[PDB]
Write a protein that binds this ligand. Structure first.
Ligand SMILES: Oc1ccc2c(c1)CC[C@H](c1ccccc1)[C@@H]2c1ccc(OCCN2CCCC2)cc1
Ligand SMILES: Oc1ccc2c(c1)CC[C@H](c1ccccc1)[C@@H]2c1ccc(OCCN2CCCC2)cc1
Lengths: 246, 246
């Protein structure tokens, strides 16, 4: 039961749920001139999405939702989630984006079309902002979970009784995550004022993350495959697990 | 001095700053068939922007910024600000959007191209959400001010000393607005837990507002004039006031 966790248990569950850090797939003994940067990043992102499913299923309360609802939330959120992870791992790399341990790019490497130089700079500024806030790992996992639960919660196109229950559940969990962030902050010695202030600062950054995702989606839709499985459909298949591998 | 206001003085200043509610301009004795819905809404939005300048100049701390910074924040925020106002005035109109007192549209009226039916539904859901939260007028003016100050704050493309001071000032004001929201909430009788929870719920809605603005921008850019003054430029002229009308 997600609504029964204590703050410590919420944090411990998020921390234990973290996905791995993957590597970009390229021949390191090959000229950099030769790689397609978008190809690299597309390959990486696509591998990260499988692990994002496994992560999401471990976010307390997520699998209490309907399959359809779980797909919708991921369909709305996945790009924000890739981005907040990128920005987290880039904190200790001022001026650079740590896409993977073997793929650290500066803004000059974002310029090869099109494109990214816009998104690049925005991602770097957000990384800068987290650096300046001394964002902690325990706060980061709360925020990534909040994105998962929140990004899609006002675009469910139903007001069925089931859909009211789904939303109410999501709002309860999100409330629990707010309580957890506040707890982390009191435990770190912050005054109540600084607690409310820092909570607000962190949530306000999620709106820049939304922006960045929308801008990035604009680029990705402007380059979309034709006779392909819709994302909803890829998401649904990865989420719609059997229990034969128990 | 904005940083010296009490919570009561912040609220009183925001409340006193509210823009007027304008009317759509059309011949009411003329078939509805004949109006261009986008034409109506474009005309209205453009009139509202002048008043948004006057509003913004009254948001404590805003005119302490540089002219360039004030233009940037408005350039990033203006569509979110029109939208949050729309959603506020639509609360008491379930299923309808109160663009103006003489222009209340349901989702079926959003369908005449293209387009809006997407944006329409999103705006209605946000209105629904505020209704369900019993959003208060005093909270609404805090949130609209937060959008003004926050939407553009991580896309200033400078790290000059002046630009560090600008950002620090913005963050201080935003902090003051957080304190004010918390104050409103304690004064309304909410427990501390409910205070943190409600603060987080309200700020999380700002990310849906960002989304909606981005989607709406996508539509507006897909219909842009050629030999026209850039928005930055229109904004700069309206903001770059003389003091000859004292
Ligand atoms: O950790 C990460 C790995 C890769 C990335 C990011 C984080 C941040 C956004 C990047 C981006 C750059 C330019 C334009 C848009 C986004 C890029 C990235 C590249 C490609 C992506 O998408 C490819 C399409 N793919 C098919 C279904 C799932 C997505 C996603 C993200
Ligand atoms: O209270 C309001 C008045 C009008 C509106 C809104 C709020 C919410 C967004 C609406 C919208 C509908 C469809 C697509 C996009 C947005 C529309 C609106 C229409 C047109 C707009 O922009 C016209 C361009 N104009 C030139 C410089 C300033 C903007 C803005 C908003």
């Amino acid at each position: 039961l997600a609504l029964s966790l204590t703050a410590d248990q919420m944090v411990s569950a998020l921390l234990d749920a973290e996905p791995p850090i993957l590597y970009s797939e390229y021949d390191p003994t090959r000229p950099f001139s030769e790689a397609s940067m978008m190809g690299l990043l597309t390959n990486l992102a696509d591998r990260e999405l499988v692990h994002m499913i496994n992560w999401a299923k471990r976010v307390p309360g997520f699998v209490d939702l309907t399959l359809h609802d779980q797909v919708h939330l991921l369909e709305c959120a996945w790009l924000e989630i890739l981005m907040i992870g990128l920005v987290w791992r880039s904190m200790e790399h001022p001026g650079k984006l740590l896409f993977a341990p073997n793929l650290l790019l500066d803004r000059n490497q974002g310029k090869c079309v099109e494109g990214m130089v816009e998104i690049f700079d925005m991602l770097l500024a957000t990384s800068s902002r987290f650096r300046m806030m001394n964002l902690q790992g325990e706060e980061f996992v709360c925020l990534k979970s909040i994105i998962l639960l929140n990004s899609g919660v006002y675009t469910f196109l139903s007001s069925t009784l089931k859909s009211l229950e789904e939303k109410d559940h999501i709002h309860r969990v999100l409330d629990k995550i707010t309580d957890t962030l506040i707890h982390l902050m009191a435990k770190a010695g912050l005054t109540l004022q600084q607690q409310h202030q820092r909570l607000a600062q962190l949530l306000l950054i999620l709106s820049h993350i939304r922006h960045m995702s929308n801008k990035g989606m604009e680029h990705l839709y402007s380059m979309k495959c034709k006779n392909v499985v819709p994302l909803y459909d890829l998401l649904l298949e990865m989420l719609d697990a059997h229990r034969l591998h128990a």
